[PDB]
């Protein structure tokens, strides 16, 4: 927004609405920033499901 300039994820387009909820979980994020080091290295993030 221009007046706030704040960025908020208060958007929902992957899902239209919510319903029938079973589980909720709040924790440390899975993807990791880890950025701050310099050079040409890239953030390769690997996952196993």
């Amino acid at each position: 927004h221009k007046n706030n300039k704040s960025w908020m994820e208060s958007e929902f387009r992957v899902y239209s609405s919510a319903n029938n909820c079973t589980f909720e979980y709040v924790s440390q994020p899975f993807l990791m920033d880890l950025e701050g080091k310099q050079g040409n290295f890239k953030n390769l993030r690997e996952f196993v499901f």
């Binding site: 950025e35 701050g36 080091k37 310099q38 050079g39 040409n40």
Partner: protein, 112 residues
Amino acid sequence: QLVLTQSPSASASLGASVNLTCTLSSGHNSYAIAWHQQQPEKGPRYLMSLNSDGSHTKGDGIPDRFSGSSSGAERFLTISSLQSEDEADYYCQTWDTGIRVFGGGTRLTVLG
């Protein structure tokens, strides 16, 4: 990536002492930095370098008042007997593998 950190403002009566300072990361303490005088409504005019040892050099058209230094992982720079013509914006810049980076700005509300 890069931290090229600059003071948004520093205030004192006519006679203060900088010529603005830049902060670097732990991994690249020893790389040299440079700045560009983007004074308001004017384009970038190249004045303001720094090597990691603090050896000073003079630009064109401004007095010898200006100095420099170095300590630890950060980079420190100085003037003696501040004058009026230092109203400007500055831009830290170091060198990487084929990249000009150009850092970020120092829009400075120094009260002169």
